[PDB]
Symmetry: D2
Subunit: 258 residues, 4 copies
């Protein structure tokens, strides 16, 4: 496939509904050799089983909250991939409290802190830690959301961390381009996954999206997986520091509901 010969680290898989899951399957379908991380004890099992199904037996622990855990992970991966071709960063978090109701009243200094640490800093931390291990031709990929560009009810502080993340995308691309690494993000339309069902009227929001989105449907993890597979391959050699909208054109339209 267009990814044969590449070695890519996929973080973030948590269920077959996960975006990273759709991204893994698509990169494997195109021939990439895959590696995986899991956050904690609760997820190791799920991730080993999916990794097995996609031909991989590289399943390593990584909590991006901790610098030591990122370094350790890259040390283990190094025994198997002295070098590789990039990773998909598909991680995000904000303390429950942060994403519901009036933004000014919900946010707290801690909430803000954690949300940015886990969703934005964690992307350049992973890069820092594996930098020398990357081949020229490598590609870094993170996942963002429209909340970073416009204020969306309930997304609250996550919008601030996503904005920080896209800017990180730009500064990471400008810093690493000289050594041969590209860095981009996919701004995905809303998809019902684990990380969502626990907040607001996500179901009513999806109905609204399907209605006003130009392609008249919400996007799927297969859609994201395909663009992701592409952003992480040599077919996108001319793209870097870009935030690509894979939301069916939702964001480029206005007042369609009327």
């Amino acid at each position: 496939g267009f990814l044969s010969g590449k070695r890519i680290l996929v973080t973030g898989v948590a269920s077959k509904l996960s975006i990273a899951y759709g991204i893994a399957q698509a990169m494997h379908r195109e021939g990439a050799e895959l590696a995986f991380t899991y956050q904690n004890d609760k997820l190791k099992g799920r991730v080993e089983e999916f990794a097995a199904q996609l031909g991989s037996d590289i399943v390593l622990q990584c909590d991006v909250a901790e610098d030591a855990s990122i370094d350790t992970m890259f040390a283990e991966l190094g025994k198997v991939w002295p070098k590789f071709d990039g990773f998909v960063h598909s991680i995000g978090f904000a303390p429950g409290d942060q994403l519901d109701g009036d933004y000014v009243n919900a946010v707290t200094r801690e909430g803000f802190k954690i949300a940015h640490d886990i969703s934005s800093y964690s992307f350049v931390a992973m890069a820092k830690a594996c930098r020398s291990m990357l081949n020229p031709g490598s590609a870094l990929l993170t996942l963002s959301y429209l909340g970073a560009e416009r204020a969306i009810p309930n997304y609250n502080v996550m919008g601030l961390a996503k904005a920080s993340l896209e800017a990180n995308v730009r500064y990471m691309a400008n810093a690493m381009g000289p050594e041969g690494v590209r860095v981009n993000a996919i701004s995905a339309g809303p998809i019902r996954t684990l990380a969502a069902s626990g907040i607001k009227d996500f179901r009513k929001m999806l109905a609204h999206c399907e209605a006003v989105t130009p392609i008249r449907r919400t996007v799927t993890i297969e859609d994201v997986g395909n663009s992701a597979a592409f952003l992480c391959s040599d077919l996108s050699a001319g793209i870097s520091g870009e935030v690509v909208h894979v939301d069916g054109g939702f964001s480029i339209a206005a007042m369609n509901e009327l």
Copy 2:
């Protein structure tokens, strides 16, 4: 390839240096069945020879300045492709005079008029004319430039027409999404082709670009061809009304020259 089973119309090929040429070769490499247009008597020969080399014998005349010529072209193509899957719009023009020196002094009402007619209107005119002929799953693709977003010395009125073109990209995507067509643009970094060497210090400009572009090199028609092949395939099903920057991250950085 990821384009097998697709039928795509490629306009704009003029020499092996042409962007549309790099786009044609890449879509053929991925398995698309190709069709071609040529502007006038001067180019027919070149285009038939390239079309032959990429397995196509559909070479039709089309001057987007004329509504009758667009309709005729789509009538001929229809005898061979009752239906197809989209086209690449890779056409642009502004009267010589328009692209050199102070913008306010260069522009004229005619210049402005022609520049917008040929570079922006021509994209929705082609869509209008072949609309019913498009399969669901189809994709429209045009080519734009950073001049549309920022003022660039000498690009002058072309910047205004490109801006009009990207907005057309958005309105065409919002109008056609319901019937199953996506519409996007690639904003390409500068490449030395026919359409350029006749204006300003393009050679010195390219040197400047290679220096400050994150990937530290200017992009090639192969780079554009690959992203183009992608935007026009089912792998980008979640992308529509988007202007993708294939300029190596040039535009997302600032003051690198220092």
Copy 3:
């Protein structure tokens, strides 16, 4: 007032509901000497009255579709103002057929051409014609709408003309900056004016803009007029080539309706 000692030409005045009317009002209050233009005779008297009420008796015919009319107006203007400090471009048009229903079906080469010639080129057409008459410190201002950046139903080809107009703002600014002229635009939110009559369910639309705007009200020709006086006064000396949004924050939110 912050506009004391400034001489400002104001186009577009057609009724007391006109944005150009709100603007004229604010600049007069801020102490500017005013001058007005009118498209045709039907408006001659109507506009002379508006002008008297604002300390002004300079009232000239000017149809922007003709270089000769623009030239002739500025020559008359030159009798009473050999030098002046800028002008307000408050002109937009597109044949009626153009603004209703599916954009792809409604648009025509002619409708596109007229929309771009009157809504966008006239702005630089005017700057061209009075360039040697502007004093250092002058400012030019035009009006745009969100349809330039987003695809909005029915706005159709005006969206393209507005995107062209916003780009004309940046190219004008870049070329005239060095001789001391700033150029900007105000992207106003929806306002009930003549030109806004008959396009769709404007009324319902206004009701939507009102429930979803951060400030929870639509903006007024007074809100716009104040930003406009600011933008053409030395107070904004550090602002050029910018599109300022005076829409109560409508464009920066998303999904407030849900």
Copy 4:
């Protein structure tokens, strides 16, 4: 002045070169009653003097890193102003090590955390703390820099904090709009101030911004102060959640250097 009858809290004043100083000046001239805060004692006296010169004797300590200090300041402020009309956030910080050289190598979890906590969260931290004290019609204003939107050498992690800050502007605006509060930011061009000392060849940089800016000069704390008085006065009533560029058009051009 257009700011008569308004009560404005101004943070960030540290020397007469400070942007907050230029702003304070303009709002005083426009007739606003002022109040100032100071980070620590080293600045206590220095700031009280600045304040006397502006018709003000309200001068309070406030270190934004602490919720308790912010709360305590606003309680003191409350003794002389049970209600007020908004405040100016003119605070940015990032450990020195953070701002020099390759961004990926320079950045650290701690540097990132501090940069985001002081440069971005403090802005909403303040709004949270004085929310019930704001009158209808109030305005909040913060300062950002182009590094939020583009990757600029050495600005490094400040770029991420500024992108977070610009997004905080839109979420603040969206949540406080309904109770009559507008929130905006000014993205200022390069100015020689304390904080700007020691980062790179700032001097050479200033020389670049000057040759390439449309207005061909760098902006001043007076240029910024005037836009700031405008943005916090009812004159800008129709503007909320906007990032206004007061950089003489620098960001809207490209390749003027060539």
